[PDB]
Structures are given as structure tokens and as C-alpha cells.
């Protein structure tokens, strides 16, 4: 098999990892195990550390400096790989012992445990004129050489490797998303009934979503238009809290429901990125560098507020209803319904991306 490696500019340090993507199984996350090869020909600093960092990267809205970003830490963990800690006595992973067997005594292991309730790797979509690193939430392993943790890290005496915390679709599909609502109007005795359902609860990226729509219009009013939309809900809990609902797919059917009649139709929508590139800030799955990634997968939670960006998706079905009559155009008569669903990648039967 193969492994990843990356060296410091001066070659003095070389980080080895088994993989870049670490799976959050909700109950537990894959541990970040690796080794650090230290070249004694160039080492003098007498202490090599490794650090796991979950950070929110962002640009300042008030600064006009191209490519300028900042990283605010949400989670930091450290391990002193060199020299081996006098207190710490921990078992090696198989990957680690294989790496030691290959590299020799100069390779010192590091193992980070990612606690639950940490944000998954999410990148917010940049605008056409962004030249800096990808903004959002990302993980990073940084191995460096210093006298102590206070020391200002020389970039040449260090090496960073971007890693991602990811989640995959649950093996067992949830209950079929259905939703209904009944609107009774002022001047009408009979109600306007809206029923909607999706074909399933779990969808994969690039997969069609089928919205079964059934309207029972027993009122005097008229449904003029039916708007279907796939909306991305993003909750961003960081310094303060922000939220948005961004439509990532939509269809405006001129389907009309006459008074005292029923209507039934299946609408099919597929969320994809190509027609959403102008929407800066849109949530995407975490990037290693600047390579394309899909619309951000749904975040799977367990059982309060979580740092970072939490993504979810809902289908909205909206009936635009005629007005007029007693209250003229003052009172809205529209009728909507919402259907939450899960948008994720299938669990890899073979290899990571």
C-alpha cells in the first residue's frame, strides 16, 4: 500500500500519514495517526512537536488586501513527538509500527484523537476575484521544530498538511419525508390542502430528487403557480452566529389549480454546482487546495450549538395563490410546505477521494 509524506523546506522534518480524510462516525472519529522523520543532520532545535488544528479561515470585510486571510482556532491539540515524553507511554497503531519499521529509529509517532461534536471540513464558495486560501472550516497537521511552545515557529523548520474530517450517508434510510398543510381562508368555508413527499430521505450528490405534489383546492381562490426549490440551510456558529437559506435548485411550474378541483404532479430537481457558481458563501465540502468540491454534504449530529458550519437541506413546495376579494391584495394567501432531507456521499466501499 501507499502513504502520504511531506517535507519541510529545509528537509529537516518529514511528516508521514496514512490518509488525508478521516471519517467521523458520530460516536467516534478516525484517529489521526502518523510519524515524523527527523533528519539528525539538520536538527539542532532539540524538540519536535506535532499539532492538530481545526480552524475557521476567513477574510476581513473591511480590509482591501488581496489574498489576505486569517485562521481562528476552534480546536487545538499538541503532541511532543521528539523527544518521547517521559510520562506518556502509549501503544502504537499498526500503521505507525509499519512506518517505524520502514523509516527507522528517527521516525517518531504522533496520534491525535478527534473528539465528537467538532465541525466537519466545509469550504465556503469564493467569488470570482478571490486569490487567498479557501475560507471556511478546515483541519491541519503541523509538525515543527522549537525549544518550547512559546517559540516563534520558523516556517522552514516546519511542515503543514491539510486534512479533512468527513461523514458519509447512513446505511439505513430514514422515513420517507412527507409533509402536509391545510389553509382555511376568510371568505371560504372549504380549505386548501397541500400534500408533498420526496421519493426517499437520503440522496447522493448529483442524484435526482422527486417531489410528489398533491393539491386539493376546495376554495374559491386559484393556484396561479407552483414553485419547487431545493434550499441549503447553513448554520454558522463561531464568533457570533449567522444563518442563511440558499436555493441550490428550483423550478417554477405554471401549473394551475382551478377552484373546486385537484391537482397531482411529480417534479424532479437535481442540485449541482455548475449553475450556482455566482453564489459566494455557498457551503461546499472541504477543499484540500482550490480543487472543485460538491455542494456541502448534510451534517450528521448526535442525540447543543456546534462551532463551524452545519449544513442541512430542505425542499420547499410553494403554492402561489390569487388574492383579491374582501381584503384585496393586502392579505397573502400563499401556501407552502417543507421537506428536510439528507444529501451525502455513499460510504466508500473501496478508497477515499
Amino acid at each position: 500500500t501507499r502513504v502520504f509524506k511531506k517535507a519541510s523546506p529545509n528537509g529537516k522534518l518529514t511528516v508521514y500519514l496514512g490518509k488525508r480524510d478521516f471519517v467521523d462516525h458520530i460516536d467516534l472519529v478516525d484517529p489521526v495517526d502518523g510519524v515524523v522523520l527527523v533528519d539528525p543532520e539538520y536538527l539542532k532545535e532539540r524538540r519536535v512537536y506535532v499539532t492538530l488544528t481545526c480552524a475557521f479561515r476567513y477574510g476581513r470585510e473591511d480590509l482591501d488586501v488581496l489574498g489576505l486571510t486569517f485562521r481562528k482556532d476552534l480546536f487545538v491539540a499538541n503532541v511532543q513527538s521528539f523527544p518521547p515524553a517521559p510520562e506518556d507511554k502509549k501503544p502504537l497503531t499498526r500503521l505507525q509500527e509499519r512506518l517505524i519499521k520502514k523509516l527507522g529509529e528517527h521516525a517518531y509517532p504522533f496520534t491525535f484523537e478527534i473528539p465528537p461534536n467538532l465541525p466537519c471540513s466545509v469550504t465556503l464558495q469564493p467569488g470570482p476575484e478571490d486569490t487567498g486560501k479557501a475560507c471556511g472550516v478546515d483541519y491541519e497537521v503541523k509538525a515543527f521544530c522549537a525549544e518550547n511552545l512559546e517559540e516563534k515557529i520558523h516556517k522552514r523548520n516546519s511542515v503543514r498538511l491539510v486534512i479533512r474530517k468527513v461523514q458519509y450517508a447512513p446505511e439505513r434510510p430514514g422515513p420517507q419525508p412527507t409533509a402536509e398543510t391545510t389553509r382555511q381562508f376568510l371568505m371560504s368555508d372549504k380549505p386548501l390542502h397541500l400534500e408533498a413527499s420526496l421519493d426517499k430521505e437520503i440522496y447522493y450528490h448529483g442524484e435526482p430528487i422527486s417531489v410528489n405534489v398533491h393539491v386539493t383546492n376546495n376554495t374559491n381562490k386559484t393556484v396561479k403557480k407552483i414553485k419547487i426549490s431545493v434550499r441549503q440551510y447553513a448554520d454558522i456558529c463561531l464568533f457570533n452566529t449567522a444563518q442563511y437559506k440558499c436555493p441550490v435548485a428550483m423550478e417554477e411550474a405554471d401549473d394551475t389549480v382551478a377552484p373546486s378541483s385537484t391537482f397531482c404532479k411529480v417534479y424532479t430537481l437535481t442540485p449541482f454546482l455548475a449553475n450556482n457558481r455566482e453564489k459566494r458563501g455557498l457551503a461546499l465540502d472541504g477543499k484540500l487546495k482550490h480543487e472543485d468540491t460538491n455542494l456541502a454534504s448534510s451534517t450528521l449530529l448526535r442525540e447543543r450549538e456546534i462551532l463551524g458550519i452545519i449544513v442541512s437541506y430542505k425542499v420547499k413546495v410553494k403554492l402561489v395563490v390569487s388574492r383579491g376579494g374582501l381584503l384585496g391584495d393586502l392579505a397573502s394567501s400563499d401556501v407552502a410546505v417543507e421537506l428536510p432531507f439528507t444529501l451525502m456521499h455513499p460510504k466508500p466501499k473501496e478508497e477515499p477521494p
Binding site: 500500500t1 501507499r2 502513504v3 502520504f4 509524506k5 511531506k6 517535507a7 519541510s8 523546506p9 508521514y16 479561515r57 489574498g67 489576505l68 486571510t69 486569517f70 485562521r71 481562528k72 499498526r94 509499519r98 512506518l99 519499521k101 520502514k102 486569490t131 487567498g132 486560501k133 511542515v159 503543514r160 498538511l161
Partner: peptide
Amino acid sequence: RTPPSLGPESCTTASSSLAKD
């Protein structure tokens, strides 16, 4: 202050062999 960064300087991420056991 909050660590600033000027994105476009690092070695390209490599890849080595690992024998089976």
C-alpha cells in the same frame, strides 16, 4: 493578534511506498 496569511511556497505533497505485513 489573529494569525494572518497571504495565499497565492511549500513543497508539493509526496507519496511513498509501504510494505505489507
